[PDB]
Amino acid sequence: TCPFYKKIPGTGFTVDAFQYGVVEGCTAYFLTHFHSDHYAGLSKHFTFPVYCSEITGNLLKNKLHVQEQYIHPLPLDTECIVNGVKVVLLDANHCPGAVMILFYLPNGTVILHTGDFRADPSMERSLLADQKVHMLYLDTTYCSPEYTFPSQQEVIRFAINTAFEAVTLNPHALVVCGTYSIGKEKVFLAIADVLGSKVGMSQEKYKTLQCLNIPEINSLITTDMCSSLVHLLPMMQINFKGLQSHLKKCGGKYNQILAFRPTGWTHSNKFTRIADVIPQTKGNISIYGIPYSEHSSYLEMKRFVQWLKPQKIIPTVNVGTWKSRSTMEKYFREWKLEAGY
Ligand code: NI
């Protein structure tokens, strides 16, 4: 049974609701992005209309095999009519293909569903500037003031400088970056660019990257591991055992590994500056955890919401405990009293 926060009142629409069977009354199923918790339930046997971005549609067709006739891609920043209701898709600043959805209801109510997003001041000059939002369905992943992390640009600066230093000192070092989903591609692309290398990976991952409309991608990535000194591996292999095992396979080409684990927030954020981050080291293997987030910090979220001034907020993350729900409602009321809406 579909929960309330995935239904859009006054429409036949649902958002990120594929794991509940046939939802009674649903005429169109929206998918905000290609992350497994959100697409859970879609497969090649699905026979209802799916609305999404072009990139998300490339992934549904090639990776999940959903048939073409049920894929409905929409351009961004463009007023579209779906089943008699005006909608707009906006870039969510999450992973490739991720959108927010603006619904203009036939009674005059305007609803924004953020999907998963990393709020940014640039969103204050999208099509959202133009009009009022009555209801906001909000990605509250990091809705508590302890959740702090740096900008994506600072994190990439640390990674590029760390990798370039290590490989310049030791031309025989290999760099490895962990992945388990789409998103965070800038980590491995920026490191490979400073090193003058293509990124090497499995056939399955190459396939996924080829769906993403990244400019000049054929110049940046490869399945030929031997030619590359930046390799991608599944996130589960980013540990001393997994990496030892990988270096064996490289046939005495390398004598050292430097690896990166992009995480979201971790408690070491509450003490340590990005500058001060140190690795875990065993022998000729070092592993850096780096806090590259594709979700809003507390401060970025609060800024966005205070600027938008919605009349009602419905959280979509951390909704399963009474303490979480109560905590989030308190911050929404502070924000409203502080800003005066
Ligand atoms: Ni996501």
Curated annotation (Swiss-Prot):
Keyword Cytoplasm: no
Up-regulation conditions: During mitosis. The mRNA encoding this protein contains an internal ribosome entry site (IRES) in its 5'-UTR. This 5'-UTR generally suppresses translation while specifically promoting expression during mitosis, when cap-dependent translation may be impaired.
GO molecular-function term, one example from the UniProt record: zinc ion binding
Tissue occurrence: Expressed in brain, heart, kidney, liver, pancreas, placenta and skeletal muscle.
Location in or out of the cell: Nucleus
Main location: nucleus
A single cellular component GO annotation: fibrillar center
Cystine pairings recorded for this chain: none
Subunit structure: Binds constitutively to TP53BP1. Binds CDC27, which is itself a component of the anaphase promoting complex (APC). Binds PIAS1.
Record's function text: May be required for DNA interstrand cross-link repair. Also required for checkpoint mediated cell cycle arrest in early prophase in response to mitotic spindle poisons. Possesses beta-lactamase activity, catalyzing the hydrolysis of penicillin G and nitrocefin. Exhibits no activity towards other beta-lactam antibiotic classes including cephalosporins (cefotaxime) and carbapenems (imipenem).
Family: Belongs to the DNA repair metallo-beta-lactamase (DRMBL) family.
Protein name, UniProt field: DNA cross-link repair 1A protein
Species this chain originates from: Homo sapiens (Human)
Organism phylogeny: Eukaryota, Metazoa, Chordata, Craniata, Vertebrata
Gene for this chain: DCLRE1A
Range of the intact protein held here: 700 to 1040 of 1040
